[PDB]
Amino acid sequence: PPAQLSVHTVSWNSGHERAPTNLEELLGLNSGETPDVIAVAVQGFGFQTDKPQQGPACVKNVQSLLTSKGYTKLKNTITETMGLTVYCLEKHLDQNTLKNETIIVTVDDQKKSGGIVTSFTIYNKRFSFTTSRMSDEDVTSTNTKYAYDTRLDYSKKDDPSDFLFWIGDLNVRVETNATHAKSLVDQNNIDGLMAFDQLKKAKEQKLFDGWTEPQVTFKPTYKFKPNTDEYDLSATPSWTDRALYKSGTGKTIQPLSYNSLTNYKQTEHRPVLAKFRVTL
Numbered sequence: 296p297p298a299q300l301s302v303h304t305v306s307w308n309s310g311h312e313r314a315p316t317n318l319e320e321l322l323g324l325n326s327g328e329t330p331d332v333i334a335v336a337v338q339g340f341g342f343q344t345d346k347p348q349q350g351p352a353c354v355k356n357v358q359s360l361l362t363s364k365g366y367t368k369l370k371n372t373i374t375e376t377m378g379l380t381v382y383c384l385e386k387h388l389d390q391n392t393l394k395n396e397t398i399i400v401t402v403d404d405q406k407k408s409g410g411i412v413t414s415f416t417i418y419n420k421r422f423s424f425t426t427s428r429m430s431d432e433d434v435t436s437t438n439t440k441y442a443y444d445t446r447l448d449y450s451k452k453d454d455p456s457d458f459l460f461w462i463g464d465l466n467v468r469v470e471t472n473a474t475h476a477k478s479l480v481d482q483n484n485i486d487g488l489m490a491f492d493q494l495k496k497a498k499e500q501k502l503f504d505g506w507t508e509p510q511v512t513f514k515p516t517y518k519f520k521p522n523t524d525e526y527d528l529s530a531t532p533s534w535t536d537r538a539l540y541k542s543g544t545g546k547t548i549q550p551l552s553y554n555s556l557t558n559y560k561q562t563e564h565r566p567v568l569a570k571f572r573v574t575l
């Protein structure tokens with residue numbers, strides 16, 4: 296049993312955009328790293344029905360690339376608005392302790408808002424990965440617009456997971472006007488602008504309680520003119536895709552890297568890649 300494992304996560308609010316065919320940068324593999332687990336989350340429109348017939352490319356191109364490196368797909372789950380896939384190096388899996396389970400939670404009668412949780416055990420430690428999606432206009436268990444529900448939080452279980460990650464657009468925004476936000480971006484005052492970000496507000500309301508974000512040094516990932524590095528100032532520049540971590544059992548989780556991937560410019564949000572090292 297190793298002392299430590301590495302975890303890469305990436306999430307993208309990708310909308311109606313197809314998967315890119317260049318996936319190595321997106322998963323954080325392009326400097327030759329071989330992380331122990333990889334989780335990929337999206338938010339957008341149409342995945343499950345898959346009118347665009349994109350599914351096979353996603354499968355063919357990912358299943359392609361990760362299999363050489365010795366990964367196994369534990370689970371892919373899709374809905375009409377969300378997607379979550381988790382992979383683990385084959386070498387770590389004991390099939391009769393793994394207890395591979397996924398739930399889906401739905402908050403509205405159209406099943407457009409809610410979340411997904413995929414959990415599994417290796418070396419007698421339990422991992423849980425969550426993504427979630429909320430609209431600004433819905434009525435919720437929380438009476439907020441933030442993409443939190445206690446049913447997706449495996450730290451609020453009688454038996455909480457050892458390592459927990461929550462990845463996606465949490466519907467947390469920057470609560471100031473665009474002029475001021477754009478001024479702070481141009482000054483590279485990232486912490487100054489973070490002062491207006493809604494995650495702390497969500498936590499004051501006991502949402503995402505005890506969940507930690509790695510330090511943010513990148514500029515807002517939204518809202519861009521597609522194919523440029525130019526903000527569309529019709530919205531206040533915000534941090535949309537986020538990675539949060541927690542342990543339910545006093546285990547150390549150390550972020551290594553937390554970055555937006557500006558080379559993926561196809562849409563209005565830029566994907567966010569986090570790398571962690573966990574101590575079992």
Ligand code: HEM
Pocket residue numbers: 307309310311312313314315335337340341342343345346347348349350351353354357358368371373378380
């Ligand atoms: C219009 C947009 C998209 C549609 C309609 C769509 C549809 C799907 C469907 C139906 C699957 C599962 C099919 C199966 O299991 O046979 C899938 C898998 C997946 N897609 Fe997408 N996709 C879209 C965009 C994206 C984007 C932007 C990403 C970003 C990376 C992505 C990443 C994935 C991943 C990782 C899988 C799992 C691949 C595997 O089997 O290992 N997709 N896609």
